[PDB]
Coordinates of C-alpha atoms in Angstrom, one line a residue:
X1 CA 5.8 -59.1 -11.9
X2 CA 5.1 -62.0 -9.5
X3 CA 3.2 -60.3 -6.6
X4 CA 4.5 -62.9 -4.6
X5 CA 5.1 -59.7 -2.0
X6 CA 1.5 -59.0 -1.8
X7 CA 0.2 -62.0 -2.8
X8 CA -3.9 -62.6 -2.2
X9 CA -2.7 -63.3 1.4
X10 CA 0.8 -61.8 1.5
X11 CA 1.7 -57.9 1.9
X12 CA 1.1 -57.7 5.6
X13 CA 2.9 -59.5 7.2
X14 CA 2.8 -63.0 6.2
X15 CA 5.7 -63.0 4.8
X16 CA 7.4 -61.5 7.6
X17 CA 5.6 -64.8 9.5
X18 CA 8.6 -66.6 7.8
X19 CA 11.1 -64.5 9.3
X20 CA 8.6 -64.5 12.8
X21 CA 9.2 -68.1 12.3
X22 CA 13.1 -67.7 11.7
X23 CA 13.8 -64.0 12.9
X24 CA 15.4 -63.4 10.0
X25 CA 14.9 -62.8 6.2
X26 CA 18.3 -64.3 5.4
X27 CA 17.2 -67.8 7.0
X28 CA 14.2 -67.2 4.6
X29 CA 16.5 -66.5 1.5
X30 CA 18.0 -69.9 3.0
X31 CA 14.8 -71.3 3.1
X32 CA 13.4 -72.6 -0.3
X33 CA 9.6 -73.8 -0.6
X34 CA 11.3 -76.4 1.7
X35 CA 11.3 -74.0 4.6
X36 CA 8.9 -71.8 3.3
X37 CA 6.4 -74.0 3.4
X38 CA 6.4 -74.3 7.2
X39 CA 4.1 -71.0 7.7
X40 CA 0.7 -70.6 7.9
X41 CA -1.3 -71.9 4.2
X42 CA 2.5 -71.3 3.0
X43 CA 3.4 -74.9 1.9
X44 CA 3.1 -75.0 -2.1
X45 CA 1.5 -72.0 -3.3
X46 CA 2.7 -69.4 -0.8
X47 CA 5.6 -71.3 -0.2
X48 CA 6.5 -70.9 -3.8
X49 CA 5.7 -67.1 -3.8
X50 CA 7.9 -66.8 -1.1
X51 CA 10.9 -68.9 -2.6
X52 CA 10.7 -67.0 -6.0
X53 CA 11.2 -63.9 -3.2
X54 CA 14.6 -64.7 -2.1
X55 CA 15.6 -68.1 -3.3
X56 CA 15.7 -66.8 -6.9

């Protein structure tokens, strides 16, 4: 239900930033919040959006 995929800032692209920053959604499903939050404004909130993504 989590619109973690088109979150207020996310839908775009921004997630893809992630994978622009890895090449690679797999390294993103390998990257927790951790990694996640290594992109732009994704560090805790983002980052978390993203984690729930692929982490689980």
């Amino acid at each position: 239900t989590s619109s973690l995929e088109t979150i207020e800032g996310v839908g775009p692209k921004r997630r893809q930033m992630l994978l622009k920053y890895m090449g690679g959604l797999q390294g993103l499903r390998n990257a927790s919040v951790e990694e996640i939050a290594k992109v732009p404004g994704i560090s805790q909130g983002l980052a978390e959006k993203i984690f729930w993504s692929l982490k689980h």
